[PDB]
Design a protein around this motif. Structure first.
Motif, mmCIF file in Angstrom:
data_model
loop_
_atom_site.group_PDB
_atom_site.id
_atom_site.type_symbol
_atom_site.label_atom_id
_atom_site.label_comp_id
_atom_site.label_asym_id
_atom_site.label_seq_id
_atom_site.Cartn_x
_atom_site.Cartn_y
_atom_site.Cartn_z
ATOM 1 N N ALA A 126 -37.900 15.598 -16.979
ATOM 2 C CA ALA A 126 -38.426 14.443 -17.699
ATOM 3 C C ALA A 126 -37.331 13.439 -18.042
ATOM 4 N N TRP A 127 -36.114 13.910 -18.327
ATOM 5 C CA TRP A 127 -35.005 12.985 -18.540
ATOM 6 C C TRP A 127 -34.698 12.208 -17.261
ATOM 7 N N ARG A 130 -37.309 9.491 -16.560
ATOM 8 C CA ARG A 130 -37.179 8.334 -17.436
ATOM 9 C C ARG A 130 -35.941 7.513 -17.085
ATOM 10 N N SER A 131 -34.840 8.184 -16.734
ATOM 11 C CA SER A 131 -33.627 7.471 -16.348
ATOM 12 C C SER A 131 -33.801 6.760 -15.012
ATOM 13 N N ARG A 133 -36.637 5.373 -14.094
ATOM 14 C CA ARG A 133 -37.384 4.162 -14.419
ATOM 15 C C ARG A 133 -36.462 3.071 -14.944
ATOM 16 N N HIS A 134 -35.487 3.445 -15.780
ATOM 17 C CA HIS A 134 -34.529 2.467 -16.286
ATOM 18 C C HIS A 134 -33.776 1.796 -15.146
ATOM 19 N N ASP A 169 -27.864 5.937 -20.932
ATOM 20 C CA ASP A 169 -28.371 7.170 -20.325
ATOM 21 C C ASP A 169 -27.232 8.074 -19.878
ATOM 22 N N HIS A 181 -37.101 13.537 -26.680
ATOM 23 C CA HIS A 181 -37.756 12.496 -25.902
ATOM 24 C C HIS A 181 -38.779 11.736 -26.727
ATOM 25 N N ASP A 185 -38.662 7.461 -27.545
ATOM 26 C CA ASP A 185 -39.793 6.541 -27.479
ATOM 27 C C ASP A 185 -40.173 5.949 -28.828
#
Ligand SMILES: C/C(=C\CC/C(C)=C/COP(=O)(O)OP(=O)(O)O)CCC=C(CF)CF
Ligand SMILES: [Mg+2]
Ligand SMILES: [Mg+2]
Length: 280
Positions: A126-127, A130-131, A133-134, A169, A181, A185
């Motif tokens: 999950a990290w 999300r990274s 997406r950044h 990140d 997490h 958010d």
């Protein structure tokens, strides 16, 4: 900036070895390009973004700073004025987020893939998601900027191309920790991260003197001051934020490390390096 200045104690070895990685990946091909790279102070910047990192972890932060500036150079000329040629390059780099690259990918893309590979190893899925997406937000921001070349309007674009969030990140990866997490958010952490982004692009536009062109420099200094005061105000809410999200002991310590080693460092380390870099 009422934050302490910090630099990794392994900074001298990291700076001395910084050229071996971009050379082996074909990002630096001449001795004159190497010296121009050394003059940027990029390992110095990395050691202030990531003072908690040493060894291979700090080397990954140096390579990211090295890659950031070698990549951004590719858009200073005609390519940056053309969104179609900008997107053609960004798509080839961002493709590394989705799988292996073809051997024919440009060197700057193979360089990013080697960083991303090292960034994700040992982090939760999950990290990584999300990274990733950044990063896509960052690459899309370059396409948006090239389209505009062909305050609020500038921020909505500059907040992605400034590259602060992928820098933050990496502090997590370099520190071998993950902020909880659900707190990442949170509205409070989102406001803290936005201040860190805004202060970085304000400081850079002044050192690069663009928000000034868009009394102006004085108003930008007051905004940096106002946002840094709000940042401290937001930091004082984190104990109650931790209770709202029912953080256990290990989660509270990860949040504390995120605050001091990732968010504070990207704010302060940028200010110190802008004052003694060869790009300016
Ligand atoms: C937060 C980061 C660095 C600190 C802020 C900096 C130097 C941002 C870079 O500003 P730019 O206007 O793109 O180029 P300049 O240095 O002014 O000639 C890492 C990301 C750096 C990038 C630029 F190489 C993002 F592409
Ligand atoms: Mg540039
Ligand atoms: Mg600038």
């Amino acid at each position: 900036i009422p934050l302490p200045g910090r630099q990794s104690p392994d900074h001298a070895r990291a700076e001395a070895e910084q050229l071996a990685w971009p050379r082996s990946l074909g990002l630096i091909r001449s001795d004159a390009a190497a010296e121009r790279h050394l003059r940027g102070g990029y390992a110095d910047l990395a050691s202030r973004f990531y003072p908690h990192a040493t060894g291979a972890d700090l080397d990954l932060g140096v390579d990211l700073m090295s890659w950031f500036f070698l990549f951004d150079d590719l858009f200073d000329g005609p390519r940056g004025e053309n969104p179609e040629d900008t997107k053609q390059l960004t798509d080839q780099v961002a493709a590394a987020l989705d799988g292996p690259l073809p051997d024919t990918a440009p060197p700057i893309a193979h360089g990013f893939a080697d960083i991303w590979r090292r960034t994700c190893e040992g982090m939760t899925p999950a990290w990584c998601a999300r990274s990733a997406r950044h990063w896509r937000n960052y690459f899309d921001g370059y396409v948006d900027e090239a389209e505009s070349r062909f305050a609020a309007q500038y921020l909505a674009m500059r907040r992605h191309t400034i590259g602060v969030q992928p820098t933050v990140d990496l502090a997590e990866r370099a520190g071998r920790f993950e902020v909880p997490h659900r707190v990442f958010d949170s509205a409070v952490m989102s406001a803290m991260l936005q201040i860190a982004v805004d202060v970085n692009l304000l400081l850079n536009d002044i050192a690069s003197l663009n928000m000034v062109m868009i009394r102006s420099v004085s108003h930008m200094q007051n905004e940096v001051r106002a946002r840094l005061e709000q940042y401290l105000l937001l930091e004082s809410c984190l104990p109650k934020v931790g209770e709202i999200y029912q953080l256990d002991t290990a989660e509270r310590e990860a949040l504390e490390r995120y605050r001091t080693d990732a968010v504070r460092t990207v704010i302060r380390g940028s200010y110190d390096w802008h004052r003694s870099s060869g790009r300016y």
